[model samples]
Target: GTSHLVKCAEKEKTFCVNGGECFMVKDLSNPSRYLCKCQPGFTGARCTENVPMKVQNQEKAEELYQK
Candidate 1:
């Protein structure tokens, strides 16, 4: 009951329920359910986008006077 292609870069192969170099198996943890997991460098669950990181920093100085 799961659709979409599951690809593994390391293996360089695709997996699916259909019998085209793929395997079909039921999810024991959650039956009648399907989900897509993104590979590394991907931001979304479906691996549709990429993410970037930026670095920022701030500094402050304080002074006190006595009367």
Candidate 2:
């Protein structure tokens, strides 16, 4: 058996994100609120802005860390 009923606006989650910078998963403290958990693994201010890096040597690693 299936039951269907009218839903309230508060129960519906918003679609998409802000500038696509936000992470996955929602904040329970404010269910309607956006902004979440991961940075998409070397991503940028948006959802899909991944780049490549190289740490071929110890000096190269240190240089990147300095920033």
Candidate 3:
């Protein structure tokens, strides 16, 4: 005999991207929602776009890098 299954709770939370680099949703107000976010050097949802071309470039920048 065949049997049917039912899911009681939601599955594990996952980021929008395949790897753990990106997330599905940034704003916590709306949970379980998906949205695009900008990536390092890149600025746009889905991380498919880049920052403005006119923006000045920086090199050897210093900051209190923290993890």
Candidate 4:
């Protein structure tokens, strides 16, 4: 699954993830494929584990009159 080793004709959003690299495979049922190993810092049916870059401060950006 290394670069230059294989390439997907067309990129598919089926194997969705966040942060880690996504690889393509010749199998589909749940979308995600264990092509390489790490799937966006996560691994499962379709990702959603070992999430990466979850340090985004999505808090206290808008607050007013909490009285």
Candidate 5:
């Protein structure tokens, strides 16, 4: 049988946080569920959690400190 699905986004306007996208999956049995696709600065089930950015590199000027 073909699988039928429901949309959580349509049902809930504010389903996910930070304006994250919500996707739904259909089960063969009879149930459907959804998950949030969060942005780069957000995480968690609803993207409500904020992730801090980390610095990976630093610049140094050796010429300025010439002896």
Candidate 6:
């Protein structure tokens, strides 16, 4: 069997988002064969969704209106 060579990320400007990485599947593949490797803070099909904050850092504004 013979397959045509293809590159998706090279053609598409937004192949990946939010620091997401793009790579080929090796040996002639289609655009669908492309994959996106998301970073630590992002997750989704293209790494666009940001992970919710687990902890809240709320500090009282005690220094406000100081004379």
Stretches of candidate 4 exceeding 4 Å from the true structure = 1-3, 6-14, 24-36, 51-67
For this target, which candidate reaches the highest TM-score against the unseen true structure? 6
lDDT of 5 by residue, 1-67 (tens): 1545544564563667555666566666645455566767786567776754343336543432232
RMSD of each: 13.9, 9.2, 12.2, 10.0, 9.7, 11.1
Worst 10 residues of 2 by lDDT: 4-13
Give the alpha carbon lDDT tens digit for every residue of 1-67 in model 6. Answer: 1555343454552677656656544544443555666768887468887755444348533442321
For model 6, what is the C-alpha lDDT against the true structure? 0.56
TM-score of each: 0.29, 0.29, 0.28, 0.26, 0.41, 0.42
lDDT of 1: 0.36
Overall lDDT per candidate, in order of appearance: 0.36, 0.36, 0.37, 0.45, 0.57, 0.56
What is candidate 3's lDDT per residue for 1-67, written digit by digit as tens?
1332221222321333322243233345654443334446554444444545453347544433211
Instruction: Single out the weakest 10-residue window by summed lDDT for candidate 3.
Output: 1-10
Model 2: residue 24 alpha-carbon error in angstroms: 8.8
Over 1-67, each residue of candidate 2 has an lDDT whose tens digit, in order, gives 1332222222232323222333233444534334432244544433344434444464543444345
Clashing residue pairs in candidate 2 (N, C-alpha, C atoms within 3 angstroms): none
Q: What C-alpha lDDT, on a 0 to 100 scale, does residue 46 get in candidate 2?
A: 35
lDDT (C-alpha) at residue 65 in model 4: 26
* RMSD over all Cα atoms, model 6: 11.1
- Clashing pairs for model 3 are 16-23, 16-24
Q: What is the lDDT of residue 60 in candidate 6?
A: 39
Q: Which residue window of length 10 is worst by lDDT in model 5?
A: 58-67
Per-residue lDDT of model 1, residues 1-67, tens digit only = 2564343333432332221232223555545333344444554334444534233324444332211
Model 5 regions lying over 4 Å from their true place? 1-13, 25-31, 54-67
